Design an enzyme around this catalytic site. Structure first.
Site, PDB file in Angstrom:
ATOM      1  N   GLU A 162      -4.363   8.079  12.186  1.00  6.71           N
ATOM      2  CA  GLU A 162      -3.182   7.460  12.319  1.00  6.71           C
ATOM      3  C   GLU A 162      -2.525   6.992  13.380  1.00  6.71           C
ATOM      4  O   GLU A 162      -2.769   7.463  14.691  1.00  6.71           O
ATOM      5  CB  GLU A 162      -2.270   8.534  11.689  1.00  6.71           C
ATOM      6  CG  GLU A 162      -0.628   8.237  11.155  1.00  6.71           C
ATOM      7  CD  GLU A 162      -0.846   7.553   9.818  1.00  6.71           C
ATOM      8  OE1 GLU A 162       0.192   6.835   9.605  1.00  6.71           O
ATOM      9  OE2 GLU A 162      -1.613   8.042   9.210  1.00  6.71           O
ATOM     10  N   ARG A 163      -1.979   5.584  13.369  1.00  5.56           N
ATOM     11  CA  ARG A 163      -1.363   4.895  14.580  1.00  5.56           C
ATOM     12  C   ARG A 163       0.000   5.524  14.552  1.00  5.56           C
ATOM     13  O   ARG A 163       0.517   5.815  13.523  1.00  5.56           O
ATOM     14  CB  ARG A 163      -1.302   3.542  14.224  1.00  5.56           C
ATOM     15  CG  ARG A 163      -2.546   2.791  14.140  1.00  5.56           C
ATOM     16  CD  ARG A 163      -2.594   1.234  13.848  1.00  5.56           C
ATOM     17  NE  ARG A 163      -3.713   0.612  13.427  1.00  5.56           N
ATOM     18  CZ  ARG A 163      -4.057   0.471  12.177  1.00  5.56           C
ATOM     19  NH1 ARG A 163      -3.281   0.828  11.187  1.00  5.56           N
ATOM     20  NH2 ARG A 163      -5.145   0.058  11.731  1.00  5.56           N
ATOM     21  N   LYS A 215       0.990  -1.318   0.123  1.00  3.29           N
ATOM     22  CA  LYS A 215       0.032   0.013   0.177  1.00  3.29           C
ATOM     23  C   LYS A 215       0.673   1.242   0.108  1.00  3.29           C
ATOM     24  O   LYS A 215       0.525   2.055  -0.933  1.00  3.29           O
ATOM     25  CB  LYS A 215      -0.974   0.006   0.992  1.00  3.29           C
ATOM     26  CG  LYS A 215      -1.735   1.125   1.243  1.00  3.29           C
ATOM     27  CD  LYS A 215      -2.552   1.491   2.489  1.00  3.29           C
ATOM     28  CE  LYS A 215      -3.438   0.295   2.777  1.00  3.29           C
ATOM     29  NZ  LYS A 215      -4.503   0.780   3.948  1.00  3.29           N
TER      30      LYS A 215
END
Ligand SMILES: Nc1ncnc2c1ncn2[C@@H]1O[C@H](COP(=O)(O)OP(=O)(O)NP(=O)(O)O)[C@@H](O)[C@H]1O
Ligand SMILES: Nc1ncnc2c1ncn2[C@@H]1O[C@H](COP(=O)(O)OP(=O)(O)NP(=O)(O)O)[C@@H](O)[C@H]1O
Ligand SMILES: [Mg+2]
Ligand SMILES: [Mg+2]
Lengths: 458, 52, 157, 480, 466, 128, 128
Positions: free
Chosen positions: A180-181, A154
């Protein structure tokens, strides 16, 4: 003017003003706190009191604490200086590199372009990627649903897209991490540095980063897509560019909206979603379009809850999508990269009228021959054997070395112009290269390299 | 003759059965997901009604 | 349901009864694939006890997974290994049923109490295929395994 | 200061403004905010007025002045709107300047009762073979277009609009059909592309586009259908004929559900309010055919509903089916196979359209209806070999491209060939090619027969025998 | 005296009175409207204020607007001069033919006939519709319900019954249009003028019409069924005559109630419905009844939301009926019309002591074979009919022929079927299905039994095929 | 009355589903907040207090009895539903009837496996 | 403490389902607005604040680490319920356990096909 906090309930804060009240959507600045705390006005409750959603934690707040009306919605740095930087939802740098020194600031709530500003021109945004350009092309001002989890390449696809659009067209990119992590936000940043799409030493960066991390309140994660949108709008509306906007994840945009709606006491709709599901989505998506000045094209990573495509969230999002890129584990395990499923990925602009007659025919021919190959997998005659070897060579010619994966592999990455892609698959369908070997078509750029790979290895 | 006919007929019937199974999987998955959504919506409406 | 769901964590041993099982005339209606105990551990009950218990659960889970396939495609489609696990599983399901002294008004059978030693032996032998030749119903609603043998003889004539 | 004619906003922030004062305001009166936004007086309460806001509520603040207009929510109507793109309130959004309309109609006006009406009798021609033959639509009728996303729903409506050019270029106002396209919840780009298409086809000049798009406030999306309908009723009540498309009512219902949940009204199925049926019922009842004493005009409606995975049994789909006079069902599986238009013949219905079909079409389509109904169970012995052979070739005649709707006599000519058995010897894969070659032949050569069928509206024995010879002689001429 | 409006939200209007408060159910008259606007008192709120339900649109109402108490509930014209006429919810002529000069009026609220007034008479009413006559026969003076989802065949069925029953019937009919299509009312009215069951020149009309359709606000849709009932009640009691009452569609009464309940601020019940769903329905349905004083044969079309028969509206309606005809979308989609579910349609007179053992046995025999076919659907859907035993194949073949022989061309549906309508005598229905069950036509193709009248037509049809 | 005077009575409640609906209305209109399926929080107690009054009396109290046959209507044959299992959980058994069985010719349409008596053979003559 | 002093720590949260239930009790009783399954709108935020604190530090900040193994209990395998959905989305990967694998003899009862680690190979030694 200066108001006073009268209520704090989680990430919801009520503020009373003595004179004129701040309009809904105005940013308010809480006085006397270490870092910056922005409250966005959501409602006028009556009796000079507004209800706001907090952009950071609300611990330590006292009733009576002073709050300043900024006079406008959240305003963020816009310009060339955003490129290569990471900012948060309220426009603060979070990469520890200092202020983002733009000569303009812009409000994150901005109306979508008006009817008169609309472009009827349907144009392909050439990515230079064979699988995408041929079979499921991107449309300028369009939205592309990016499907697939992790381990299917990705981020490398994303980085190559940024690299290619800047190289081919001269348009910049904006990445909005919605939910977002923090670990993955760090990884992406350093991967972008390694690939060269972010340069820390000069002004050649191709992406601006906007992060709304998972540990931030609902209000922050809900608005961060708008912040990213606003950065992109500068490059379109002020610099006439064809801009790329990545939204990772669109479901987390919806989810944060649901959480905000819940916190404000609004009654949930079907499946627990906000009653404003479609308008929340619409007011955001409609800002992504082709105008007279330019275009913002958006690639949006899609999570499908419960694998239910009829779930309100994906169903509402699908209304705004013009194309899909399906990244597949099956395609990845076959060694084909990018791992884009050539049959599952579709585009609304795959039309003999929008794209060329030459474009449509070849792409339809590639689709048919790949489906017919799958039909003949179950089971051949001279015509069937001819269609099998042609399709296997087509499977390989869909693969591509990426410029972004050059230091990692050593293999020279390729950007393939549109007409070179069309004529490449055209010469395989005609059986002009059924005289030559099969694996000479694996991991190459333009067809001239596949001929040379057969000329060298004979 | 019999086995040539029997093997063809089994191939035929199983092809059709596998197709019928496919269409039933789709039909059942759709019923599942409508029920899945309805359960969530119904629970929420009971909670909201109790709170109001 | 929140009430029973919240109760599980407060227990050391759980006996889960099922209407799906009661409906079949299997009493007590204990779900052998949803009842647990902290002491079901080879170091506590011994390896023999533990092995037979896990063997019984495995055969029953294998059968449960097959039931629906065989209901449509038929028994004759099963391999010899599969139809052996079917017949043994159905005998095991039945040998788990038992007439209770307090249930005599419901069963019409005298109540029975089975020593643990006899319980282990009985299921061991069924698992080992020692009663493959006996009818299914011989195993239904009895105490020790000797009654199943006696019932099989009685079922002949 | 004037608490009778004016008020002040007490609170705002759930799509509704609570306003103090306005003592003389009527229920459902339009009010005007300081910012220039409009609103509808919804809730008259002892101490406040609840106002639905036709725009973004960011533009309204506590303390803002609100003014009576004295008028129950209404919109401009008239011929001045033809060729224009307007928002839900009837304001121009196409940058083409002022709209001259002087008259106005209330958006909520109740549909005509029993007595002002008469049975639908006049054809509303789509120019789409599958529809005009098998699912015929009359002037005054309501006919639902229903199917999953991207199944060809809007395309049905667009070809119907484009089709009317042939009547609208005439001078007989009774044969003309003025069009209204209501976009609800769509992308602005989609609507823009739509008007471009209509303009290119010279159809925009007799069309009004009303647009409340994905980024427009929910109350505007709620309003849009009613506003468009009032613009249509102008024609209906002026002794003329209008066609309205609601694209789509699924998105309108979603918009109304947003409003209703924010008003904290008790939800039911899929969290929709209990009046969601009535939302659509009161709207579609207004499409009607008027008797001669009322001018003889009509309003025809083509509402659009989007299904999830072909499920017509869901709440909103069943609601609208229980309102309209039949449905055209578009099926993903058919669309996927390349069947276009993707109309499921068997599942589509016209409840009142047969009386609104020309005799010419009634003839050849009734026997096609029979020959397809006898084909939908056989889909080899000679008795069923003919039923299959005919059915596949007839199915090929029901295929059609976009943007070229067909004259009724041209439709009657192509269907004539398949029904009478002039395609039986030809292979199914070459029917589509034959049709286009046959059509250019009858247009170029035999205008006298096509003109006579068009005028008489019937195929007489002279016309039948004459047409018999033409198809026979062309079939022998047609080689590859 | 006079009241003043204090609040308006949709159909719900609050009115304050200075002297004398109208009792619940009283009709109030709003002053200054172009057309009569009636408010019906629903509740006393306290502080001299009542909560009311409007019988027409509330647009244009202002707080402070005057309201007068009529001193009575809504009263409507009843009697012979309602025949041939169309009236609305409040008994106004809506046919442009002037005043309805009846000698009497009646309040639309009346109490249900008492237990002592009940008739236990159960006599068959033969419809000529095979499915109905065979399996779930209607009774004279009985309560009949026609259940159906959107588009499955409710109205076509009620129209066929008007065709098959009303002409054979000797008395008056009342049709109440409740929340349905206005254009369907136009169709019915003019078709009745054409046939002569409504005569505009003479006093020979046999039908009275009452309409409150889906263009109306909910107060009107909630009350219009009562208006229809009141008209029928007169003919039943003050004329002691056989009355037919047709209602399309009674669900719309309950739906309208749900809309008003939401505006009244009640805590909602299951599926968002009014907490009063069942009692409201009971108070209305208990008036739709035969008494010792006179007969009402009632036929009510019953809409089924999202095809869900467990929805509180249709689910609560069942127990109010003596015969039920339940339609199925799945059956309609297979091409079987009328789309009656033969295993979900019932009648109180399906009893051997009432219809005779022959009728009863054939009916139950038909239902047994159909149920046996039904509980094989799982296996058939996967593997087809060819996997079944010879025994089960026989039951499938006969059940499929029976399914088809239960279909029938309606005089009213000729445009859609393409066939001339058929009416079948009861004895012929019994005989035809008797012969199929006996295996007398095992050799005949299934399609021969589709869309015919008597069994002889199925024989003739098969002869033309082979 | 019969129960407390050394006599035996049988009572049929036809049906308790409709009683629960009437009670739900009253409760909602008294503004008591709804629970599961909008029924009042104590819908169980409504039926449990009624059905507990059916009892067999010892000889000291006359030896009389009251037997109850309450009736519950299910929807789509779901014996495992909320209100059904509420009432099943009160009574000393249940007779479960099904449409499938009914039309198969199994009349009375009793599902044997799903029906129970909680008194059993103690309520039978030795012959039975 | 270990993370910030150049050391490595492992934390197990057994389990976060029960933590969410406790927070829901408080939120509801504080009359905060209920959502799906009666959980408040900040229930995601509850777990994301917690789990984001697990981190690997760079050499500049000591090189320490905190690894988290949160535990979620599902009901009848519904990994798409509210709280499971939240924590699945927050974490870097999931080990899915199943009842029918457990009783089949698959112990540990890991569904290998569904379980994932997005860190993957980066966390393995060359031998593995
Ligand atoms: N008769 C036809 N022949 C060929 N293509 C067609 C035809 N009708 C429609 N299409 C194409 O099919 C696609 C979808 O059609 P459209 O009319 O947008 O359907 P829709 O259901 O309104 N889509 P949406 O509103 O986005 O869910 C478009 O690209 C059309 O160009
Ligand atoms: N007996 C029948 N024979 C043939 N076709 C029928 C029959 N009944 C219904 N249909 C078809 O179904 C359509 C709708 O029938 P109708 O009786 O109006 O249904 P309904 O249940 O009253 N629909 P609605 O009132 O919208 O909920 C008709 O126009 C026919 O096309
Ligand atoms: Mg469309
Ligand atoms: Mg109807």
């Amino acid at each position: 003017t200066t108001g006073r906090i009268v209520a704090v309930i989680g990430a919801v804060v009520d503020v009373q003003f003595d004179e004129g009240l701040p309009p809904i959507l105005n940013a308010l600045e809480v006085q006397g706190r270490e870092t910056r705390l922005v409250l966005e006005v959501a409602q006028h409750l009556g009796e000079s009191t507004v209800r706001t959603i907090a952009m950071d934690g609300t611990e330590g707040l006292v009733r009576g604490q002073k709050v300043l009306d900024s006079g406008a919605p959240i305003r963020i740095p816009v310009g060339p200086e955003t490129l290569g930087r990471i900012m948060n939802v309220i426009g603060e740098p979070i990469d520890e590199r200092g202020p983002i020194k733009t000569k303009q600031f812009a409000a994150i709530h901005a109306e979508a372009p008006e009817f008169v500003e609309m472009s009827v021109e349907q144009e392909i945004l050439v990515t230079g990627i064979k699988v995408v350009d041929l079979l499921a092309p991107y449309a300028k001002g369009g939205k592309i649903g990016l499907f697939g989890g992790a381990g299917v390449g990705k981020t490398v696809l994303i980085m190559e897209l940024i690299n290619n659009v800047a190289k081919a067209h001269g348009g910049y990119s904006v990445f909005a991490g919605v939910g977002e992590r923090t670990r993955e936000g760090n990884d992406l940043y350093h991967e972008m540095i390694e690939s060269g799409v972010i340069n820390l030493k000069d002004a050649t960066s191709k992406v601006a980063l906007v992060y709304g991390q998972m540990n931030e309140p609902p209000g922050a994660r809900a608005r961060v897509a708008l912040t990213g949108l606003t950065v992109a709008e500068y490059f379109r509306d002020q610099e006439g560019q064809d801009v790329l906007l990545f939204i990772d994840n669109i479901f987390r945009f919806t989810q944060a909206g649901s959480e905000v709606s819940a916190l404000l006491g609004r009654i949930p709709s079907a499946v627990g979603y906000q009653p404003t599901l479609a308008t929340d989505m619409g007011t955001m998506q409609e800002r992504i379009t082709t105008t007279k000045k330019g275009s913002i094209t958006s690639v949006q990573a899609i999570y499908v809850p419960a694998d239910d495509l009829t779930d309100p969230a994906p169903a509402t999002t699908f209304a705004h999508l013009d194309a899909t890129t399906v990244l597949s584990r099956a395609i990845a395990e076959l060694g084909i990269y990018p791992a884009v499923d050539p049959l599952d990925s579709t585009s609304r602009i795959m039309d003999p009228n929008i794209v060329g007659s030459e474009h449509y025919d070849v792409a339809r021919g590639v689709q048919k021959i790949l489906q017919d190959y799958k039909s003949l997998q179950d089971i051949l005659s001279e015509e069937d054997k001819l269609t099998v070897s042609r399709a296997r060579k087509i499977q390989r010619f869909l693969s591509q070395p990426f410029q972004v994966a050059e230091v990692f592999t050593g293999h020279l990455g390729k950007l393939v112009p549109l007409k070179e892609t069309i004529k490449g698959f055209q010469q395989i369908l005609a059986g002009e290269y059924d005289h030559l070997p099969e694996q000479a078509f694996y991991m190459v750029g333009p067809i001239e390299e596949a001929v040379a790979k057969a000329d060298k290895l004979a | 003759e019999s086995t040539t006919s029997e093997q063809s007929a089994r191939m035929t019937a199983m092809d059709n059965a596998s197709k019928n199974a496919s269409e039933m999987i789709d039909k059942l998955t759709l019923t599942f997901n409508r029920t899945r959504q309805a359960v969530i919506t119904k629970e929420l409406i009971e909670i909201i009604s109790g709170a109001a | 349901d929140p009430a029973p769901a919240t109760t599980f964590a407060h227990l050391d041993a759980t006996t889960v009864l099922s209407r799906a099982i009661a409906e079949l005339g299997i009493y007590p209606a204990v779900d052998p694939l949803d009842s647990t105990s902290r002491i079901m551990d080879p170091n506590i009950v011994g390896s023999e006890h533990y092995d037979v218990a896990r063997g019984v659960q495995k055969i029953l889970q294998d059968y449960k997974s097959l039931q629906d396939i065989i209901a449509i495609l038929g028994m004759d489609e099963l391999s010899e290994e599969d139809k052996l696990t079917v017949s043994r599983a159905r005998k095991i399901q039945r040998f788990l049923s038992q007439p209770f002294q307090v249930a005599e008004v419901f069963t019409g059978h005298l109540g029975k109490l089975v020593p643990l030693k006899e319980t282990i032996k009985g299921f061991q032998q069924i698992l080992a295929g020692e009663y493959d030749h006996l009818p299914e119903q011989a195993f239904y609603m009895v105490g020790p395994i000797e009654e199943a043998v006696a019932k099989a003889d009685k079922l002949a004539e | 200061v004037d608490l009778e004619e004016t008020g002040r906003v007490l609170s705002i922030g759930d799509g509704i403004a609570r306003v103090h004062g306005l003592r003389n305001v009527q229920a459902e009166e339009m009010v005007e905010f300081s910012s220039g936004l409009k609103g509808m007086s919804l809730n008259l309460e002892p101490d406040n007025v609840g106002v639905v806001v036709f725009g973004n509520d960011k533009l309204i603040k506590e303390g803002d002045i609100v003014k009576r207009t004295g008028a129950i929510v209404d919109v401009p109507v008239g011929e001045e709107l033809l060729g224009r793109v307007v928002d839900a309130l009837g304001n121009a959004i196409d940058g083409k300047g002022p709209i001259g309309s002087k008259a106005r109609r209330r958006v909520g006006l109740k549909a005509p009762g029993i007595i002002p009406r008469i049975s639908v009798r006049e054809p509303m021609q789509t120019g789409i073979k599958a529809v005009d033959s098998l699912v015929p639509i009359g002037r005054g009728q309501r006919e639902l277009i229903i199917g999953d996303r991207q199944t060809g729903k809007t395309s049905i409506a667009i070809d119907t609009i484009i089709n009317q050019k042939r009547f609208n270029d005439g001078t007989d106002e009774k044969k003309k059909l003025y069009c209204i396209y209501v976009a609800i919840g769509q992308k602005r780009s989609t609507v823009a592309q739509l008007v471009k298409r209509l303009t290119d086809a010279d159809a925009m000049k007799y069309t009004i586009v009303v647009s409340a798009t994905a980024s427009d406030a929910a109350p505007l999306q709620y309003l849009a259908p009613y506003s468009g309908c009032s613009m249509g009723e102008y024609f209906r009540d002026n002794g003329k004929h209008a066609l309205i498309i609601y694209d789509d009512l699924s998105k309108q219902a979603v918009a109304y559900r947003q409003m209703s949940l924010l008003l904290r009204r008790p939800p039911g199925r899929e969290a929709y309010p209990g009046d969601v049926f009535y939302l659509h019922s009161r709207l579609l009842e207004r499409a009607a055919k008027m008797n001669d004493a009322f001018g003889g005009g009509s309003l025809t409606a083509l509402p659009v509903i989007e299904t999830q995975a072909g499920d017509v049994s869901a709440y909103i789909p069943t609601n609208v089916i229980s309102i309209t006079d039949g449905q055209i069902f578009l099926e993903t599986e058919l669309f996927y196979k390349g069947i276009r238009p993707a109309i499921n013949v068997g599942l589509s219905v016209s409840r009142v359209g047969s009386a609104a079909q020309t005799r010419a079409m009634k003839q050849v389509a009734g026997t096609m209806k029979l020959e397809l109904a006898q084909y939908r169970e056989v889909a080899l012995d000679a008795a069923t070999q003919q039923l299959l052979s005919r059915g596949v070739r007839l199915t090929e005649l029901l295929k059609q491209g976009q943007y070229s709707p067909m004259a009724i006599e041209e439709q009657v000519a192509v269907i004539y060939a398949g029904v009478r058995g002039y395609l039986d010897k030809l292979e199914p894969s070459k029917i589509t090619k034959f049709e286009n070659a046959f059509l250019s032949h009858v247009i170029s050569q035999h205008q006298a027969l096509l003109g006579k069928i068009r005028t008489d509206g019937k195929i007489s024995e002279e016309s039948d025998a004459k047409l018999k010879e033409i198809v026979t002689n062309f079939l022998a001429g047609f080689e590859a």
